[PDB]
Design a protein around this ligand. Sequence first.
Ligand SMILES: [Mg+2]
Ligand SMILES: [Mg+2]
Ligand SMILES: [Mg+2]
Ligand SMILES: [Zn+2]
Lengths: 132, 337, 62
Amino acid sequence: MKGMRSNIPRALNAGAQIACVDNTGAKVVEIISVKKYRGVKNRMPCAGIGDMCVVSVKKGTPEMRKQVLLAVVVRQKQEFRRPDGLHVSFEDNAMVITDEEGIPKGTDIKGPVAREVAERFPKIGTTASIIV
Amino acid sequence: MASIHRPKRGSLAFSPRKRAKSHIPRFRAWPEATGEPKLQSFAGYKVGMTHVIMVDDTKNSLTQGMEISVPVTVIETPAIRVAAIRAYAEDSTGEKAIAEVWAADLDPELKRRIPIPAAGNQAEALENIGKLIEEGRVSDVRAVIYTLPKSLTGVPKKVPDIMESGISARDLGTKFEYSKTILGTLVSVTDVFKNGTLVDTAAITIGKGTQGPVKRWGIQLMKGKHSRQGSLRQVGTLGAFNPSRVSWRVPQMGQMGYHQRTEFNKRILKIGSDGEEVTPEGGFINYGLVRGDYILIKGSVPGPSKRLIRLRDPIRAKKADLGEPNILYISRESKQG
Amino acid sequence: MEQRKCYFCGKMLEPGTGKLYVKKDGSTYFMCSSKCMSNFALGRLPRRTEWTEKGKIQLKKA
RNA sequence: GCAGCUUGCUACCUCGAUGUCGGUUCUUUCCAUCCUGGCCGUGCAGCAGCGGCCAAGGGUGAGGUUGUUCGCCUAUUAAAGGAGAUCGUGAGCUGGGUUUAGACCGUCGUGAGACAGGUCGGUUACUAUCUACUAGAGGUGCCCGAGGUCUGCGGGUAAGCUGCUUUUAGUACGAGAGGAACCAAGCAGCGGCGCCACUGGUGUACCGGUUGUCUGACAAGGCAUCGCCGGGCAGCUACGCGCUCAGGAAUAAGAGCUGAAUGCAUCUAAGCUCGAACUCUGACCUAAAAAGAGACCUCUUUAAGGAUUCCGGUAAAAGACCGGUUUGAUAGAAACGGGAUGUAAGCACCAAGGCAACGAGGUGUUCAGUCCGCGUUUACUAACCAUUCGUUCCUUUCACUU
RNA sequence: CCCUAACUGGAGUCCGGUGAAGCUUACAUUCUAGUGCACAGUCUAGAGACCUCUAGGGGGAAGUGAAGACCCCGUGGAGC
RNA sequence: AGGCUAAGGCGUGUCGGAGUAAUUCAGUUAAGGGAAUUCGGCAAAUUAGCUCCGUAACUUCGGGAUAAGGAGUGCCUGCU
Ligand SMILES: [Mg+2]
Ligand SMILES: [Mg+2]
Ligand SMILES: [Mg+2]
Ligand SMILES: [Zn+2]
């Protein structure tokens, strides 16, 4: 997609369970694969901030559970750097449930969200209240 | 067998990976001239790295205009003396040295490298090279330069490093007359490179000794149960049954580092004249403080501190004129904290 | 070039250095070095550490 | 008909053993091409297909079952091709299956026992002689003697390959829906090379807290994985960071121009112009041990200069390499700068209390104390004293010196 | 494991002392193809190759260990 | 038990110097992810003493049971 302004390490890889922080009803979602990521041999599919991911709901409502959805990771403990040289990090990982193009399924996002995903997916920026 | 495909480990583009045959990098090719006469190369010594907060000026970049922190590399680049003027005769076999003329006046420190040439055939060698250029035997003129590291306190040496730097002009008579003007003089790095222009940095990289295949080629460590069976940092197989020989393309241990490498499009960010503008508190680590005139190069450069760095104008520079940078802050805080 | 102050030691964040640590509730802390971030992560308080300027402030209160 | 990549047929080689499947690691090869590049046809409007030709430079992944090969299934993806290399690869690994000795189930057999049936368990030996490769040196060969700077016979490369988004453009096309390409820009995936300002790891230098115990108590220390725990400079390193283009020539399929054989027409029979991720040049690494064994300049012949002794680190497995040597800041000390930890011991007061003695601990002296495999100033000490080669070695086979 | 990194002690590397063993008809600096009992460093035709030493891990020597324990044969055995 | 010390026995679990690679035997630590590795959580990691609260299916009524899930713990002053 559109290039962000900050370098983001691909912290999360396939099999990680990330606290889904929207009101979609899915609580914990496991990363199955990552859109727009061709791998190399033996390398697990990694996903840093602003990446769309294919996830399966592990914990949540009875209707969201076991589905395969599209999610965007909005926070990560693995620190990234801003263009001015400062490194930014978060207390926990988190992803929101979205569509192919970037529109979230939920209506409010609890907690902060990195500003890079706000500038890439502007609907994710507007839906979330506090942006970091 | 359902083959799983992996790219080859390491590059065969840089083989045989042996120890480079000189501490001075050598340029195999030089860019064609596009303007007024000037030396195409300068030599400096790498001091260390810092970072600047420069306003972004790169056209079409995402972060244009806004503040960025660019890792720079301060390089201590005093004046150089254009020692000799050497002309080459081109033929079917190749370029061959046809004649040289050394400068009459030269630094006394040069004796540690080569015995000092006498101030003899200065006018007559020049007229001989002029006649050779006139008749047509001469094709290109190059200048011999050496550093004068006796001033630098961070570099322990005082012997010059001698190297050839081609002149950049249009006509071989024009090149000869410019070389006559600059022969035997001290030309600062401001007379070669301009502020904001790309260059090519070549230098013998950091020697890492006899390193193993996992570090030399980035091969895979043995995984899982194979990690503790007796071969962990060893290549899994050296060849098939046939052909009955180890290929040269198999990863193996050997000399890692201390190779010559060329880096393209290393931008110049600052042309300074006082070492206190960039020298941090406590000096640089294992170097000292800057005492001559320097240049700030964006990004990394091959080689450790104190290594000779050869600078030439770019040979494959994609981008146009870039303009003067706008440094807001050269970070001269301590590198030891 | 916004001027940033370290949450723990009180040192001013120099340009091109430091970290920005964010909690789950949107609170942001500027850490000048790994030492300040590690002391924050242990649960220590700047007021109860004498080398920080907050600890010096509290000790010079009395 | 081809291939010999499945199963057969055969019995030519091997039974004084060519370690037998599958996976893993790493390298290479073929094209009958899955994707990437170039074309042709269409029942090709566009988008997207379908079929064919050229093309092997690069890519061809991650997972669930199963020992599997194969095959299915999942979500990505440009695509997630196939095959060869003793069904590549056990003096590399694994040991899941098959193919030992034990045992159970079923079926055969009167029985011992058997099953191209299933199940559980079941030893991976070796100090590398030669060769090959990978790097590092010592010689001679070439050669006025030495040094320096270059050239380039050659060798190598993928040094890049490929997607996503924006613009072109909601335009061409189309009745509508739907919907491209040329140029340009940014970012990303993988690969390559390099680096340590920033971030992260380590950091058994160092600093602090503290358990148990020993040295009589305090102080200072020993041991218990660095006792454990917290922090971390330098260094190294990635999880961090820098760079990573073409252009040109000749071409394959193909598309044409001129043009006859065949008065015309014809891309072909001569000739000519374009035409690809291929080839070549261009970059980049290496390259006088190129037997055509190189070119030029400088210095000087008992010298030029090299090596060793000495102080070192930009280097280092040994060698080698790169510097300094009193006309010197090469390494060390002293001091200071810059940093690591967190406020030392002793003393004064306070301390929940205790009649008292005592008292964990708090505050002041004290941003203290301790420490720095970093820098600067500084010859204070140590880089001094030598030494050997550049003489065949004796000879008066002499260019001599008793 | 993605994906490896740094550090510690013992080896290894280098040095002083001591000090064996296993493979071995000979030669041997190889590489390609063919031929040959159809799996060649020694044949045939080409291509490369100056020699010596050190370190490296194991491509090849159908590497060494060993009169195959699988299959067959023996007017050979043993146990049941 | 394990750790630290007496007495007692020893520096002979009879090769030393040196601190310069790769690799190897045995250890320490490792961001973010947490079995995605693999035939298989093999190996390693986690937890761990004592007191108190509390403890399920099922059961041959004996058990399961230390089930599981939790809290406290040092030092000093003074006492019962
Ligand atoms: Mg083998
Ligand atoms: Mg036999
Ligand atoms: Mg018979
Ligand atoms: Zn701070």
